Amino acid sequence: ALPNLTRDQAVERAALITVDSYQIILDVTDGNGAPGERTFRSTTTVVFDALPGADTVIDISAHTVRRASLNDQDLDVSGYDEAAGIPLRGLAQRNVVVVDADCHYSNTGEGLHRFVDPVDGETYLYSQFETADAKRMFACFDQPDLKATFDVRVTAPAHWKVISNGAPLAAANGVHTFATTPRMSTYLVALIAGPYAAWTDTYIDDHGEIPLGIYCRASLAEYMDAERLFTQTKQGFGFYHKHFGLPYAFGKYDQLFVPEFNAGAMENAGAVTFLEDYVFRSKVTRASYERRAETVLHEMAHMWFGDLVTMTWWDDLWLNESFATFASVLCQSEATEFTEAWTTFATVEKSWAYRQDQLPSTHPIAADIPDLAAVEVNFDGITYAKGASVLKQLVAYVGLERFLAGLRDYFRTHAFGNASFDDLLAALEKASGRDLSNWGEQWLKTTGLNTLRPDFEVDAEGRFTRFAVTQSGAAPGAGETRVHRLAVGIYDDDGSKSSGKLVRVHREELDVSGPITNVPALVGVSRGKLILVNDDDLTYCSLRLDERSLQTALDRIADIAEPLPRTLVWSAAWEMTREAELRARDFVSLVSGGVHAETEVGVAQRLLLQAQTALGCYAEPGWARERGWPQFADRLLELAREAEPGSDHQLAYINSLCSSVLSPRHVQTLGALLEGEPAACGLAGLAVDTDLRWRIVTALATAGAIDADGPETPRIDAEVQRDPTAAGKRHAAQARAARPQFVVKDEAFTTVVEDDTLANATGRAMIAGIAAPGQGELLKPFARRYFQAIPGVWARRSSEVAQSVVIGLYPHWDISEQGITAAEEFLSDPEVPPALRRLVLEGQAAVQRSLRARNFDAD
Ligand SMILES: [Mg+2]
Ligand SMILES: [Mg+2]
Ligand SMILES: [Zn+2]
């Protein structure tokens, strides 16, 4: 097991050593010019200064350590254990350590991952090291405040491309060398190698030229849209260079779509890796292009927030992720075609922030992270989305100019170095010309949400006689009220002699503080028909509406002209549903009747997923099975049939039908789309392409309509013959596990929780099939099996890989007091490690929320 580095251990090591350079020499061949299969050779030379006479440890996870030396004295490696690294005893002032090892390839997305493409037999490698998996590829002091230069050399099969952080030098006789990097952290070192297809372009401005590359597997090249990605890339560099002062510091900029990736992307300096789902093989909506552009711009923002300046320790991961999230959405809004990015943020990412902040594991943005175990579960909706939301509010509070000026100072001060909370706040304080210590304490060091509401009286002509914004204390948390810069918007009719649309007819900006903030400027103003006290989504809060405004919202959501205020209403309704203030069936009604007016297909997609959570988790289950699901499925098919042919909305409604709980009529309709012209089904212009076929096959498998005679799967196997790709095989694995047969669920469950050799990406696909909609009664036995299995999975697999089972197989379907008690009994053992307890507490809290919602929906 790799070492669980503690905050205290990291501080202790950084007080003793300062690293200059690494030289990393890799051989990823089999020693005969072909790709290696199990291990690769890694020979690392590190130069570092030390307090003379101290001891340290160099980290390394290897199959074999062949030799290790300190200042050319050979070390005894006969007792080598990856948990202990290699001890370095009696350090000199100036040191050279060499470690020559055979390291293991990964098939679980941590370390140097190896994949074989079934289409062409080609091998592809990529690295992934955040947080502390660099030690699986090279010996190092694996912590982010021990920066160093990197000089990488790789021996590879002759036909391969080889990409690292640095620009390539000409390769010779299998050997690829790279330009030495600037000083950076070990978790950012990259290796991507194999017969990847390439595209090239260049970004040019007054600062100079950045060579751009895009890479993907050869078998996916026909699907690449490199011009669109290069356009977005260049828009990003133009925006960041306009605002951040220091230009991009890491040379060239390669973007590599890699197989079996665990996350969405990773900001390795000069060598950003991506989930290869972003190479679209089939038709996707604008939602997918917009999310991919956000990801491109997020990784690029990290070239400043994480790569140029890095947090000292993982408690300040928000310095990377809150800022990268905020900056990427700002850049998307202002520099790209995705001009509604703040609308998408308010519906998609803020909903994630609220869910995370309300769990019993809620933690401040500036977190307390005692060890690696704690950070490996902290890449979450607070570190990302709440932090970005709170930074958006800081920009409202001090203004964008002072905010950006403070960041430009921060970058210049800490360039190629490390920063903590106190360093960031010092820079923003200097630039803002005011004390932000109280602001930081109440916003960055707290948990929870403040509820914001209008409180007013009106005269007989509907004009305010008094208006305030009321603010609840933070919950869950320490109950404080905060300072907010926010806007009050009043919405009313735009029509000539007509209702027409609800448009903004009055706006007031104000400084809100404490429980009640009077708004004198609204005395004598018409109350209109809908009041929003977080207009333009400037602050992080729980928004609620006065009675009349809420009735207007529930009746006229489709009349709100502008996407952002319409999203503020969708979000308030969804949050009221989560909070047992709006019945599940009323939220489903609202979406079913209003989504035709939601022009932003990304927002519409999220509303349909919410409606599906409402039906599957929040609604009285008898009503959901007998009425709610079949009505929602019928509405999706009506919506699809009324949509424009070939449109994004047409596809979204059919995608949602494929993930719903189906009646026999819906099963017939979807099966007909596999065999026939879609026009015959009233769906002219719908492309029943490779991935929509798989979504339909998975729906038919889930419904018991195909391969229902026994565990054999001739129909799904025929679909793999049609699409015999790594993607088709993972979709097939999902579809086979989705079938409502106990023996199929049991075989899949046992495979994924037992077989440590199974690729994590395949496991995940099987888990998505196990936990299929509508199957909660069938899956009840797997609740106890889950609680009995997860300690072993957590002990055998890394946190990130174990999470596939711990998060993905939590029994969210067992919505009962017995299900709550099952988690309580697991949690009653005080020796369960804190990160595993956290994930079970979160699962238990989601089921508790579902029970409270079902009681509200029934009554
Ligand atoms: Mg071939
Ligand atoms: Mg990781
Ligand atoms: Zn990030």
Of 299, 321, 429, 842, the catalytic one is 299
Which ligand does the CA of 159 lie closest to? 1
Strand partners, 56: 88
Q: Quick one: which of 455, 520, 531, 443 has its CA closest to 487?
A: 531
3-state secondary structure of 811: coil
Distance of CA 131 from the midpoint of ligand 3 (Å): 12
Q: Quick one: which of 576, 683, 583 has its CA closest to 636?
A: 683
Which ligand does the CA of 122 lie closest to? 1
From the CA atom positions of the chain, what is the Rg in Å? 28
Distance of CA 160 from the midpoint of ligand 1 (Å): 13
Distance of CA 203 from the midpoint of ligand 2 (Å): 30
**What backbone torsions phi and psi does residue 96 show, to the nearest 5 degrees?**
-130, 120
Tell me the residue type at 261: F
Q: Is residue 853 within a helix (H) or strand (E), and if so which, with residue range?
A: helix 834-858
| Close Cβ partners of 213 (under 8 Å, ≥ 6 residues apart) | 163, 198, 199, 200, 252, 253, 254, 255
Distances (CA, A) of 450 to 358, 470, 472, 479, 541: 12, 10, 5, 8, 5
The pair of structure tokens assigned to 93 is 């002032």
Which ligand does the CA of 266 lie closest to? 3
Cis ω for the linkage preceding 476 (within 30 of 0): yes
Signed CA dihedral, 763, 769, 773, 778: sign only: negative
Distance of CA 766 from the midpoint of ligand 3 (Å): 27
What is the rounded CA–CA span in Å between residue 38 and residue 29?
A: 10
| Torsion (CA) 511, 320, 304, 289 in degrees, nearest 10 | -90
What is the rounded CA–CA span in Å between residue 620 and residue 632?
A: 15
Which ligand does the CA of 120 lie closest to? 1
Distance of CA 726 from the midpoint of ligand 1 (Å): 16
Right CATH for 309-444 from 2.60.40.1120, 4.10.140.10, 1.10.390.10, 1.10.3720.10: 1.10.390.10
Other CB atoms within 10 Å distance of the CB of residue 818: 9
Distance of CA 560 from the midpoint of ligand 2 (Å): 42
- Residue 579 is a catalytic residue: no
Distance of CA 273 from the midpoint of ligand 3 (Å): 12
The pair of structure tokens assigned to 147 is 């920066």
Distance of CA 742 from the midpoint of ligand 2 (Å): 34
Domain coordinates of the chain in residue numbers?
A: 7-195, 309-444, 451-539+541-551
Looking at residue 628, what DSSP letter applies?
I
| Close Cβ partners of 133 (under 8 Å, ≥ 6 residues apart) | 2, 61, 110, 111, 187
Distance of CA 379 from the midpoint of ligand 2 (Å): 9
Which ligand does the CA of 119 lie closest to? 1
Which ligand does the CA of 377 lie closest to? 2
Strand partners, 44: 24, 99
CA atoms within 13 Å, Cβ hemisphere of 828: 7
Q: Quick one: which of 611, 394, 369, 601 has its CA closest to 483?
A: 394
Ramachandran region of residue 672, left (φ > 0), alpha (ψ -120 to 50) or beta?
Answer: alpha
Distances (CA, A) of 759 to 8, 107, 195, 763: 34, 5, 21, 6
In CATH, what number does 7-195 get?
2.60.40.1730
Alpha helices in 703-813 (DSSP H): 714-722, 726-737, 742-754, 760-770, 776-779, 781-796, 799-808
* Terminal alpha carbon distance of the chain: 51
Distance of CA 123 from the midpoint of ligand 1 (Å): 11
